[PDB]
């Protein structure tokens, strides 16, 4: 019935279908881009983290980024964000996370990830210009469910596989 697990790539998802991703190590989940107004990159944070300034690999080149995990036992999925090619990342969204998944979605002029704290996930959305068109680069194994199944995704970020 669900439709993966497919390898990490770049590719061009449909509109209306969650990329549901099921990272193993913290670090970059997935990126995408319109490469004009909207760049997003998920980051996994490992549980309990003071404020500290990492290096990571975003659209292929390193950035330093300032992060923290509040929690002491749950993961944290960021999304960092550009508006402009050359403008600083900020932090946006955050996902507090038991069962360690995390989907991203292409959906009316915008792309939707998970929201909030296991297992009462909410969405929220980021407005980017040519959704339709924007690849996402997964850097580990994900499936794809159809935004009619979004129950479905809910329940897997609630409560995992
Ligand atoms: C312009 O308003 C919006 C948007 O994009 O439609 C509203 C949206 O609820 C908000 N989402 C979050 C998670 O904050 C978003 C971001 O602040 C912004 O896209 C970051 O770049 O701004």
Redesign the pocket.
Known sequence: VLDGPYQPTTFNPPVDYWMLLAPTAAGVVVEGTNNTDRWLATILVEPNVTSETRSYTLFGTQEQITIANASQTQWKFIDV?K?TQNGSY?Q??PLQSTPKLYAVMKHNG?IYTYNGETPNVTT????TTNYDSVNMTAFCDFYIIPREEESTCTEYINNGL
């Open positions: 964000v508006t900020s946006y969204g915008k929220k959305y980021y407005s």
